Amino acid sequence: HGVCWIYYPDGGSLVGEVNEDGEMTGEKIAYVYPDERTALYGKFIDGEMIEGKLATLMSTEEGRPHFELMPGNSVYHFDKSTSSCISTNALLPDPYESERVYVAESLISSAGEGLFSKVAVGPNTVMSFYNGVRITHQEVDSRDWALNGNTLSLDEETVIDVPEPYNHVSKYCASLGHKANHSFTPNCIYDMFVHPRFGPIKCIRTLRAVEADEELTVAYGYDHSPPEAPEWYQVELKAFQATQ
């Protein structure tokens, strides 16, 4: 008759009354984001989100979460990408990400758009998700760098990509992590994340406090001595090494 909370290493969690087999199955299960406040509440089967409605975790009483549903009929479902499909709702934003980041012109010269904080946050804060289609390292490594601007290694078997035209916010805004530019003195890192809609992906997490309207940057981590990297990154590495 109790409630259970199961946390992922990234700080998100599933919460609810488990069934006889210890599974997160029911009509009142929730995924709670790492702010411990934004939640997707509703029907889950063995921890997979079937219909999660946007909610706010208002309090816990005896361990039991007390949610308030947000207005608007915002509903989400598990929707892991494939090699060819990035999302079934490319234009439906992630509600936690939408409160934390926006896209605008980068402050880095000739670097296109960048990702910026909406609000002040502390260290270790998950800001944005890096979802994309899932393809192999062989495909990515055997094609030209001009097609590999948005490729992010997930693990030894899978690379996440945001190919054209999903690199434009008008065609894809379900996640925004591909909009963060590179720096050798970054304020964020790529980190593993298990997302209830996107499945196992990576996120952008701050390494230190960031101010409102500060540009979020991450180290892209190309191999400097296999560098195997785009020319703009090669140029910047030589500059970084000279400051050191």
């Binding site: 990515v140 490594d141 992010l152 030894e156 892209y220």
Partner: peptide
């Protein structure tokens, strides 16, 4: 590899 963040 021609992707970000691989563990070398």
């Amino acid at each position: 590899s021609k992707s970000k963040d691989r563990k070398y």
